[PDB]
Amino acid sequence: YCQKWMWTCDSARKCCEGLVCRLWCKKII
């Protein structure tokens, strides 16, 4: 499964919905 909340995230990895792939899967609007 994609990167969950508070997970890692490269320059453009594959995170889950509701998350931002800015270094780390930031769970915020």
Curated annotation (Swiss-Prot):
<dbReference type="GO" id="GO:0005576">
    <property type="term" value="C:extracellular region"/>
</dbReference>
<keyword id="KW-0964">Secreted</keyword>
<feature type="disulfide bond">
    <location>
        <begin position="9"/>
        <end position="21"/>
    </location>
</feature>
<dbReference type="GO" id="GO:0090729">
    <property type="term" value="F:toxin activity"/>
</dbReference>
<comment type="function">
    <text>Potent and specific blocker of Kv4.2/KCND2 (IC(50)=5 nM) and Kv4.3/KCND3 (IC(50)=28 nM) potassium channels. Acts by altering the gating properties of these channels. Also shows moderate inhibition on human voltage-gated sodium channel Nav1.7/SCN9A activation (IC(50)=423 nM).</text>
</comment>
<keyword id="KW-0632">Potassium channel impairing toxin</keyword>
<keyword id="KW-0872">Ion channel impairing toxin</keyword>
<dbReference type="InterPro" id="IPR011696">
    <property type="entry name" value="Huwentoxin-1"/>
</dbReference>
<feature type="disulfide bond">
    <location>
        <begin position="15"/>
        <end position="25"/>
    </location>
</feature>
<feature type="modified residue" description="Isoleucine amide">
    <location>
        <position position="29"/>
    </location>
</feature>
<keyword id="KW-0027">Amidation</keyword>
<comment type="similarity">
    <text>Belongs to the neurotoxin 30 (phrixotoxin) family.</text>
</comment>
<dbReference type="GO" id="GO:0015459">
    <property type="term" value="F:potassium channel regulator activity"/>
</dbReference>
<keyword id="KW-1220">Voltage-gated potassium channel impairing toxin</keyword>
<feature type="disulfide bond">
    <location>
        <begin position="2"/>
        <end position="16"/>
    </location>
</feature>
<protein>
    <recommendedName>
        <fullName>Kappa-theraphotoxin-Ps1a</fullName>
    </recommendedName>
</protein>
<dbReference type="GO" id="GO:0008200">
    <property type="term" value="F:ion channel inhibitor activity"/>
</dbReference>
<keyword id="KW-0800">Toxin</keyword>
<keyword id="KW-0960">Knottin</keyword>
<keyword id="KW-1015">Disulfide bond</keyword>
<dbReference type="Pfam" id="PF07740">
    <property type="entry name" value="Toxin_12"/>
</dbReference>
<keyword id="KW-0528">Neurotoxin</keyword>
